[PDB]
């Protein structure tokens, strides 16, 4: 079946999306830490 396939492709991209979200959150925290470091000076 092809519907099931497309469905799995979407599922795989969903996992990719979750990884990009993780990365964005990591970067946000790191930028925030730097901003705070400089403000604290």
């Amino acid at each position: 079946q092809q519907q099931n396939n497309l469905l799995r492709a979407i599922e795989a991209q969903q996992h990719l999306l979750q990884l990009t979200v993780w990365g964005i959150k990591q970067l946000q925290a790191r930028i925030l830490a730097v901003e705070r470091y400089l403000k604290d000076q």
């Binding site: 092809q2 396939n5 497309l6 799995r8 795989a12 996992h15 990884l19 990009t20």
Partner: protein, 36 residues
């Protein structure tokens, strides 16, 4: 999770997706030839 692993997992899902796209397309061309 780390950035090295992150990159590798991204690559792993990406290279999978492409291979899956071609799969679905493969069958579709196969079925089109079937029903002509």
């Amino acid at each position: 999770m780390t950035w090295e692993t992150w990159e590798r997992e991204i690559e792993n899902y990406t290279k999978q997706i492409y291979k899956i796209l071609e799969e679905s397309q493969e069958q579709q061309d196969r079925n089109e030839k079937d029903l002509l």
